[PDB]
C-alpha cells in the first residue's frame, strides 16, 4: 500500500535524524569507553551485575536495521549505556566519570533532537 510506503519513509527519515544524533553523542566519548560491548571474556561476572548491556556499536546495528520506532526507544538505549556504567563502576573511576560527562553533554543534543522530531513530525 501507499500508506505503508509513507510510514516507511517516515521511519527512514527518523533513522537519518537518529544517525546524526548518534554521531553527535558518540563524539562526547572521545576516550571510546562506550564504543563496544563490555567483553564477557574480560569481565566474566558482568551479566550478574548488568541485566541489559548496551554500547554504541550495538545501537548502531539496531539503527541500521531501522530498529528504532521513535526517539524514546533510542533514548532508552543511550540511558542504558550511562546507567549501566554508573552502577558497575565506582564514583572515583575514569569509567563512571566518563559516563557523567556523556550524560551531561548528551542532554544538550537530545533536548534539540526532541524538538526536531516533534517539529518535522
Numbering used by the authors: 22 to 142
The authors write:
In contrast, PanDDA directly eliminates the thousands of strong electron density blobs with no statistical significance, objectively identifying only regions that are unique to each data set; the ground-state data sets are provided by the many hit-free crystals. Finally, the averaging generates an estimate of the ground state that can be used directly as density, bypassing the need for any subjective modelling and map interpretation. All crystallographic data used for the PanDDA analysis must also be made available so that the analysis may be reproduced.
In this work, we show that unencumbered views of the changed, non-ground state can be obtained by recasting the problem as a multi-data set, 3D background-correction problem, which allows the relevant signal to be extracted from conventional single-data set density. Our new method—Pan-Dataset Density Analysis (PanDDA)—comprises: the characterization of a set of related crystallographic data sets of the same crystal form; the identification of (binding) events; and the subtraction of ground state density to reveal clear density for events.
